[PDB]
Ligand binder design. Structure first.
Ligand SMILES: [Cl-]
Ligand SMILES: [Cl-]
Ligand code: NA
Length: 82
């Protein structure tokens, strides 16, 4: 129900850009934990990142709001080398 974690990704080769499309009907989102499925994380709203090895990676976003509630979304992506 609230908050709702959500994002969309744009993949270029091994590199990924994000758009944060999260929301909260009962408060305000104050923090983010992105988890790129490779051991890397970020606290940015809409980070850019990259991988080294071609493969399948799960990208997870957790959002947390002003009342201390969290929600998580995931997307698995393919990335390839040249
Ligand atoms: Cl990698
Ligand atoms: Cl994909
Ligand atoms: Na709100």
């Amino acid at each position: 129900i609230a908050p709702v974690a959500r994002f969309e990704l744009k993949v270029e080769g091994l590199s990924v850009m994000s758009q944060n499309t999260s929301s909260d009907s009962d408060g305000n989102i104050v923090s983010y934990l992105w988890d790129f499925g490779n051991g890397q994380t970020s606290t940015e709203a809409a980070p850019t990142w990259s991988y080294t090895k071609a493969g399948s990676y799960s990208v997870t976003l957790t959002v947390t709001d002003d009342k201390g509630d969290s929600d998580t979304h995931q997307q698995t992506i393919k990335v390839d080398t040249p």
